[PDB]
Amino acid sequence: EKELLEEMKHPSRARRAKARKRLEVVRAFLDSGNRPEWMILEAVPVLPPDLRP
Amino acid sequence: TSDPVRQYLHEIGQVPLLTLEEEVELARKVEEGMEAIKKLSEITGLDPDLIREVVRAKILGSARVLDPKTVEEIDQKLKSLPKEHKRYLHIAREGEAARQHLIEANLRLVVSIAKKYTGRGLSFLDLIQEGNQGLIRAVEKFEYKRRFKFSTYATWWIRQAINRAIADQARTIRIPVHMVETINKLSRTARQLQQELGREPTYEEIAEAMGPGWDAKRVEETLKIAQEPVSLETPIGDEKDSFYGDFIPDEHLPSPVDAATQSLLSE
């Protein structure tokens, strides 16, 4: 997040936009408390049988 | 990028084939490595499976993930034996490497065999993977001393693995292997009696043609148990709006009338 905040001082507009877009995801993860590694599945949940009868 | 069949075919094609000399050498090294590993097990007194596993893990390297503590301790103990014994360990390493190289080089026979089993409830890649398992079995059990080519012994195991996988996994409701064979025999007999009779035979004909111990009721039960389930999402009508499961009522939960009757009865 600190690297991206410093990246937001560049005169370029496209680079600044890219830094902002990356920061959206970084800050969402930081505020929500979700860990990024949870986006990779290790245990697959299994739906109850009565909903897949 | 996509189409994993192309990727797998390219990856197998990146390994060159083998000549008679290379094949015989690899078989000799695997056999002497197995003999050497059993000799090490006898010398050290440990279980042969465990020393096989530690030798294989040390060969495969850190890249491939019993924990590292036991493998290191037993390896170092194994690297402590006096001379005329550690030579066996070296032969075991070379034999394990030979086994890997042999499987890697003969993977293409698995694809060649498995390409003729499509359309039977298993995808192409699944058939190849089960053929690979059968190839591993054949490699492990192969005996070169008989001077026969490896593919002759490998084909039988590959076919056995593919057939067993088809019998085990092709059906939503699993039917045992002997019962699956019974169903296949029933189908073959009925097909031959259909061709011969110029019409679909009745159940008595099939029962007579199977042999003693078969009556029409048993044939009917066998065909009933051979029925596969249909999808609840089968589209009904041309428009994409009606599914089969939309026409099936729930018979488990009590209806409002039934619940009211029970409550009034309790009252």
Binding site: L41, V44, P45, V46, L47, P48, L51 | -
Partner: protein, 47 residues
């Protein structure tokens, strides 16, 4: 019985939706005014 109908509860389709969202590895929770969990399954799915 001649009385008026009582107040309704959570429909079963919302429970089905919650279960199908859990199968996609998404944690859906219903909360009260103080952000505490509210169990809409009556306790039948809690170990």
């Amino acid at each position: 019985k001649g009385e008026d109908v009582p107040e309704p509860s959570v429909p079963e389709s919302f429970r089905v939706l919650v279960k199908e969202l859990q199968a996609l590895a998404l944690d859906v929770q219903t909360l009260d005014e103080k952000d505490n969990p509210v169990d809409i399954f009556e306790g039948l799915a809690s170990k």
